[PDB]
Design a protein around this nucleic acid. Structure first.
Ligand SMILES: [Mg+2]
Ligand SMILES: [Mg+2]
Ligand SMILES: [Mg+2]
Ligand SMILES: [Mg+2]
Ligand SMILES: [Mg+2]
Ligand SMILES: [Mg+2]
Ligand SMILES: [Mg+2]
Ligand SMILES: [Mg+2]
Ligand SMILES: [Mg+2]
Ligand SMILES: [Mg+2]
Ligand SMILES: [Mg+2]
Ligand SMILES: [Mg+2]
Ligand SMILES: [Mg+2]
Ligand SMILES: [Mg+2]
Ligand SMILES: [Mg+2]
Ligand SMILES: [Mg+2]
Ligand SMILES: [Zn+2]
Lengths: 115, 153, 224, 110, 307
RNA sequence: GAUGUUGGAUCAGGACACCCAAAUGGUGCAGCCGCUAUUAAAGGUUCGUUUGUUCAACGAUUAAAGUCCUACGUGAUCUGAG
C-alpha cells in the first residue's frame, strides 16, 4: 500500500535516483482508481523539483501469501514510453512481475535478481 | 459486542477483579463455605475448582507453590490447601463445589445471593433440594414400565 | 540412553474456539494425507530453512529461498511460517503455506531454538543477524535429542522500532536492552506490566487429553 | 427540550397502567416439607437455611475458641460432637468440637 | 385454580431420571433406522426430468472454514456444511401453496422431545421421526415431489454445480450509525464537542418531517440473508459433508438452508443430478469416500509442477 | 415578551434548463476527433497548493470532475476562521 505523499527509495541506477537533494522523493499520484498502489502499479513521483513516472517494485506492506515483502518501498524511474530511464536494477524484484510482459517488458529485461 | 466471552467485569477493573476473587477464595479455603453475591460466587466457582487441581499436583511442584502463594492470601491456609483440602479429593474428578441460590438479601439493597461450599466440610448439611421418592404415583407408575422392559428382554 | 519426547507439529494443536471437533478430524486427515507425499521436517522459530517452490513465471520452474523461521501460526491445513533474509542489503520476508501444493521440497540446514517464540524484532536488529549465505550446506544433527538453545543477545538500530519491544507484553529475552535503552525508559516499560496475568489460572489452556487423542490418531494413520 | 403541554390524566393512566408496568404474578411458589413455610422452587428454603446458618455461626464461635489467635488454623480434619457422643476410630486423630445441644434431628451422624 | 408451572423433569426420582432418557434415545434410534430405507418401503412414483424442473433442497450445519487449492495454483477458502438429520416432513400440493409450485417442508437437526410444544410433538408422532430443530419450506415442481418422511443425504449435490444458501446472519444487537450503515464520522480533534459518532443532519428544513426510509441506529444483523452463485468443490460421503465456496452467512455451528442456484446462468444445470434426490439403496454401489471437482488439487497428488 | 445570521463538517430530499453513462436526427459528417439538436433522471459526479472564503487561479487525474432549489438545506448534531 503506497499512497500520496509516501517517501519512496529509487532502486534503479539513474541520474535522478542517486544524486542528493534536500527533499526525499515523494509520491504525488497513484494511477489506480484506488488511492493505494501495489507491486506492479504505476506512480507519479516528485523528485528534485520535477515530475517523473515510476513503477512500484516492492513495498513494506504485506501482500498475498508467498509474495516477497520488502524492507523499504522501492520504485524504478520511468518515462511515458514505458522505457526505464535507468540502466539496471540491483535490489531484488518480485517474480510475480513477470506475469505482465506487455507493459513491463524492458523493466524486466534490465532486472538483475528475482525473488 | 459481547460474543464468546467467559469472564464478567467486576470491581474497579481487571486487577480489582482478580483481587475480589482473591478475597473470596481465601474466605472459601478458610471457612469452607461462604455466602456471597450470585454473580461473584458463580465467578469464583471456576477458580475454586482449579485451585484444588494444583493441590493434587503435589507439595513439591514449584509452579503449584507460587500459584498457591498468589491465590491464598492468609498464609496458614496453604498447608491447609495441600495437607487437608487436596487429599480428601482423590477419586472425584470434578465434584468439588456445591453452588446453590439463597433467598435474596434482607438489606435494602436486595442482591441475588448464593452459597458456595466444598464437599465434605464439617458443617451442618445444607438443606439441599430433595428428589421425589419412588412411591410417588408417577414414579411408581414408571417402575411397571421398567419391569416390563426387563420382562421382554 | 534413549531420551524420548514426541514433537508434535504445532498446527496439530486445535484453537480454543467452540468449533465442532468433527472439523479438526477432517483437517488432520487431509494434512496427514499431505505428509505422505512431501516430507515435512521439524524446525523452530530461529531455525534456518531452504524452500523449493514451483514457479510458473520463471524459466527454471524451481525457485529457491533460504532464511530464518521468524514465526509460525495457523491450525489444520492453513498452517504457515515466515522466512527472513537479507539479499544484497534488502530485507526480505516471505510467508509460506506449510501444506501448499506448490511447495516441492523443504530442507533444514540448521536446526535451532532462539530464546523467543517469535522474532519480528529482527526487523529492527542490525543487518548482520538477518544475513545468511545462500549456498551454505546442511549442518546435520547429532541426535542428542536436545535441540540446541542458542542464547544470543542482539544489537538494535536507534529508536523507533517497528514495535515497542521493551514492553512486558512481548516478554523479549533475546534483545540486548542495556546498550539500547536508558533506566528511565526501563521504568516506563514497567508501568504497562500486568503481574496478575501469570496467576490467572482459568486463562490457562488445557490440551493433554486432545494431545493423546490426536497423537494416537497419527499413529493410527501411519499404520494404515 | 421542554414539554410543550401538560399531559391529561387520561394519557397518564394509559402509560402507567400498561400491562408491562404491572407486577407479574409469580407462579413458582411452593411449601417446604419440613417447616411448611413458603419458598420458590429453584431456591433454598429461607427458614431452613436460617437454622442451618445459626448453628454454623455458633460452631464457628466455639472453633474460634479452640484456636488461639488470628493466623493459627488446624491441619487436621475437624469433627463436631454433641452431648453424649464419643469419637469413632474413623474420626479419631482429628480436631474435636464439643457442644451442649443434643444433636439436631436434621444434622445426621454419618 | 392457580395452576403451577411444570417442566418435564420436575417430579421424576433418581431411579427414573436415567430410565426416561435411555428410553427416549432408544425409541429415537429405532425410529431413525426404521426410516433408513425409503425405496423399499412405499416409494412414490418417480417422474423423468423435464427442462423447467426445480429440485428439493437440504438443511445443513456450518462447521467452519478451511483452505483448498486448485490444480491451477490459486488458493480458495471453503465452508464445510454437514447434513446431520435431514428428512422431508410434509407436502403441499400445487394449488394449496403458491398457486404455482408445490411446497416441500424439510426438517433439520434432531432435538430433545422434552422442550417442544404439544402440537409439534403431535406432528412428529403422526410421522414417526424425532423432532427437528429447524424447519424450512422449499418450492418444487410436480415432477420433483418426494414422499413425506424420507431421508435426504449429502450426496444430493454432485461436485461442481452452483448452490444458494440462506441463513440468519451474525447478530450484532443495537448498533450505532457508523456500523449499521457506514456513515463517516465527524473529525476527532479540531474542537468537535460530543459529536464523534452521531448521524448528523437527518433531514431538510422545509419538509419538517423525517422521511419514512431514513437511516438510523438500530437492530443489525439478525435477519435472513441469501448468498447466491457459490460453487461446490468436494463432497464427503461418510460424514455427509459438502465443501462450498467462499463464505456462508451465519455463525459457525448454525443451521443453514441449501438449494440449487436460481441464478439465470445456471437454469438447466439440474439435468445431471440424481432427480427425485439421491438414493444410496437404489444404485447399490459404494460411492468413493470423496467426490472432487476436476479442478481441485486432491489431499494427495503429484505436488504441482508448471512447465 | 428573539424566525440565532457567512463559509466548511456530516447526511442528503428534489428539479431537469443532462456534465458522464444510454438510444438516436443534422452537418461546412470519409474515418478519428468534433460542433449542434431530440428523447432519457435508477446511478454517479475526485484528491491537493493559496485564501475565512463560496467564486477564481493553479498541480494531478478521472466516464465525468453538471446548472440549480430545499429558511443563500442542515448550529435543541458539530465547527466559529469570518
Ligand atoms: Mg522548483
Ligand atoms: Mg457472554
Ligand atoms: Mg460495576
Ligand atoms: Mg456461568
Ligand atoms: Mg509501524
Ligand atoms: Mg449478538
Ligand atoms: Mg473518523
Ligand atoms: Mg471529545
Ligand atoms: Mg462547550
Ligand atoms: Mg413567543
Ligand atoms: Mg442527493
Ligand atoms: Mg430534456
Ligand atoms: Mg441525481
Ligand atoms: Mg443557511
Ligand atoms: Mg451555517
Ligand atoms: Mg435546527
Ligand atoms: Zn424449610
Amino acid at each position: 500500500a503506497i499512497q500520496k505523499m509516501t517517501r519512496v527509495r529509487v532502486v534503479d541506477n539513474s541520474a535522478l535516483g542517486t544524486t542528493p537533494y534536500h527533499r526525499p522523493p515523494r509520491c504525488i499520484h497513484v494511477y489506480n482508481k484506488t488511492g493505494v498502489g501495489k507491486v506492479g502499479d504505476r506512480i507519479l513521483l516528485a523528485i528534485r523539483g520535477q515530475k517523473k513516472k515510476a513503477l512500484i517494485v516492492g513495498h513494506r506492506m504485506p501482500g498475498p501469501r508467498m509474495t516477497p515483502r520488502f524492507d523499504s518501498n522501492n520504485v524504478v524511474l520511468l518515462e511515458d514510453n514505458g522505457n526505464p530511464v535507468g540502466t539496471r536494477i540491483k535490489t531484488p524484484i518480485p517474480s510475480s512481475l513477470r506475469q505482465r510482459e506487455g507493459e513491463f517488458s524492458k523493466v524486466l529485461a534490465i532486472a538483475q535478481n528475482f525473488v | 459486542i459481547s460474543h464468546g466471552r467467559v469472564f464478567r467485569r467486576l470491581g474497579l477493573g481487571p486487577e480489582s477483579r482478580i483481587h475480589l476473587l482473591q478475597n473470596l477464595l481465601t474466605g472459601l479455603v478458610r471457612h469452607e463455605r461462604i455466602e456471597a453475591s450470585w454473580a461473584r460466587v458463580d465467578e469464583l466457582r471456576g477458580y475454586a475448582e482449579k485451585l484444588i487441581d494444583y493441590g493434587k499436583l503435589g507439595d513439591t511442584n514449584e509452579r503449584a507453590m507460587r500459584m498457591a502463594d498468589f491465590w491464598l492470601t492468609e498464609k496458614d491456609l496453604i498447608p491447609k490447601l495441600f495437607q487437608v483440602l487436596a487429599p480428601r479429593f482423590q477419586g472425584q474428578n470434578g465434584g468439588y463445589t456445591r453452588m446453590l441460590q439463597i433467598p435474596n438479601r434482607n438489606e435494602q439493597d436486595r442482591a441475588k445471593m448464593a452459597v458456595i461450599e466444598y464437599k465434605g466440610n464439617c458443617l451442618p448439611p445444607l438443606p439441599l433440594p430433595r428428589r421425589d421418592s419412588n412411591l410417588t404415583l408417577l414414579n411408581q407408575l414408571l417402575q411397571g414400565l421398567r419391569q416390563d422392559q426387563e420382562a421382554s428382554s | 540412553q534413549r531420551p524420548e519426547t514426541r514433537f508434535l507439529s504445532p498446527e496439530f494443536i486445535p484453537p480454543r474456539g467452540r468449533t465442532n471437533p468433527l472439523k479438526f478430524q477432517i483437517e488432520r486427515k487431509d494434512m496427514l494425507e499431505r505428509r505422505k507425499i512431501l516430507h515435512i521436517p521439524e524446525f523452530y522459530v530461529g531455525s534456518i530453512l531452504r524452500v523449493t517452490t514451483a514457479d510458473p513465471y520463471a524459466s527454471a520452474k524451481t525457485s529457491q529461498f533460504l532464511g530464518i523461521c521468524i514465526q509460525r501460526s495457523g491450525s489444520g491445513l492453513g498452517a504457515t511460517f515466515i522466512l527472513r533474509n537479507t539479499i544484497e542489503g534488502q530485507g526480505v520476508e516471505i510467508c509460506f503455506e506449510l501444506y501448499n501444493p506448490r511447495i516441492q521440497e523443504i530442507q533444514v540446514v540448521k536446526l535451532e531454538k532462539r530464546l523467543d517464540n517469535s522474532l519480528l524484532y529482527l526487523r529492527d536488529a542490525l543487518p548482520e543477524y538477518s544475513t545468511f549465505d545462500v549456498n551454505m550446506k546442511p549442518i546435520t544433527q547429532e541426535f542428542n535429542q536436545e535441540v540446541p538453545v542458542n542464547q544470543l543477545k542482539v544489537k538494535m538500530k536507534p529508536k523507533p522500532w517497528s514495535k515497542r519491544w521493551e514492553r512486558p507484553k512481548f516478554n523479549i529475552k533475546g534483545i540486548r536492552f542495556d546498550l539500547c535503552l536508558t533506566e528511565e525508559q526501563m521504568r516506563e516499560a514497567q508501568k504497562w506490566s500486568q503481574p496478575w496475568l501469570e496467576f490467572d489460572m482459568m486463562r490457562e489452556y488445557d490440551t493433554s487429553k486432545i494431545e493423546a487423542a490426536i497423537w494416537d490418531e497419527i499413529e493410527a494413520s501411519k499404520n494404515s | 427540550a421542554a414539554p410543550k403541554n401538560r399531559r391529561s390524566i387520561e394519557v397518564n393512566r394509559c402509560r402507567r397502567r400498561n400491562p408491562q408496568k404491572l407486577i407479574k404474578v409469580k407462579n413458582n411458589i411452593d411449601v417446604c416439607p419440613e417447616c411448611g413455610h413458603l419458598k420458590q422452587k429453584h431456591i433454598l428454603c429461607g427458614y431452613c437455611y436460617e437454622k442451618v446458618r445459626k448453628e454454623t455461626a455458633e460452631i464457628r464461635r466455639q472453633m474460634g475458641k479452640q484456636e488461639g489467635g488470628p493466623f493459627r488454623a488446624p491441619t487436621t480434619e475437624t469433627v463436631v460432637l454433641y452431648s453424649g457422643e464419643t469419637p469413632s476410630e474413623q474420626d479419631q486423630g482429628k480436631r474435636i468440637i464439643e457442644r451442649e445441644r443434643k444433636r439436631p434431628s436434621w444434622f445426621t451422624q454419618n | 385454580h392457580g395452576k403451577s408451572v411444570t417442566w418435564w423433569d420436575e417430579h421424576l426420582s433418581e431411579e427414573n431420571v436415567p430410565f426416561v432418557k435411555q428410553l427416549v434415545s432408544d425409541e429415537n434410534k429405532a425410529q431413525l433406522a426404521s426410516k433408513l430405507c425409503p425405496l423399499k418401503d412405499e416409494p412414490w412414483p418417480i417422474h423423468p426430468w423435464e427442462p423447467g424442473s426445480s429440485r428439493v433442497g437440504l438443511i445443513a450445519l456450518k462447521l467452519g472454514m478451511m483452505p483448498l487449492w486448485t490444480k491451477d495454483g490459486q488458493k480458495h477458502v471453503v465452508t464445510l456444511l454437514q447434513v446431520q438429520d435431514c428428512h422431508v416432513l410434509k407436502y403441499t400440493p400445487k394449488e394449496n401453496h403458491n398457486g404455482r409450485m408445490a411446497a416441500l417442508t424439510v426438517g433439520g437437526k434432531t432435538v430433545s422431545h422434552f422442550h417442544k410444544s404439544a402440537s409439534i410433538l403431535e406432528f412428529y408422532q403422526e410421522l414417526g421421526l424425532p423432532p427437528k430443530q429447524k424447519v424450512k419450506i422449499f418450492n418444487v415442481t410436480e415432477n420433483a415431489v418426494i414422499k413425506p418422511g424420507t431421508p435426504l443425504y449429502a450426496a444430493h449435490f454432485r461436485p461442481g454445480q452452483y448452490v444458494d444458501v440462506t441463513a440468519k446472519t451474525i447478530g450484532k444487537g443495537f448498533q450505532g450509525v457508523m456500523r449499521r450503515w457506514g456513515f463517516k464520522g465527524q473529525p476527532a480533534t479540531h474542537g468537535q464537542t460530543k459529536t464523534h459518532r452521531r448521524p448528523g443532519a437527518i433531514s431538510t428544513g422545509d419538509v419538517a418531517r423525517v422521511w419514512p426510509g431514513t437511516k438510523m441506529p438500530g437492530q443489525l444483523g439478525n435477519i435472513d440473508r441469501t448468498a447466491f452463485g457459490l460453487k461446490v468443490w468436494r463432497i464427503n460421503t461418510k460424514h455427509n459433508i459438502i465443501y462450498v465456496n467462499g463464505s456462508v452467512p451465519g455463525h459457525k455451528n448454525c443451521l443453514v438452508k441449501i438449494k440449487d442456484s436460481k441464478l439465470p446462468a445456471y437454469k438447466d444445470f439440474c439435468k445431471n443430478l440424481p432427480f427425485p434426490t439421491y438414493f444410496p439403496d437404489g444404485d447399490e454401489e459404494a460411492l468413493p469416500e470423496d467426490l472432487y471437482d476436476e479442478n481441485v488439487c486432491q489431499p494427495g497428488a503429484p505436488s504441482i509442477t508448471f512447465t
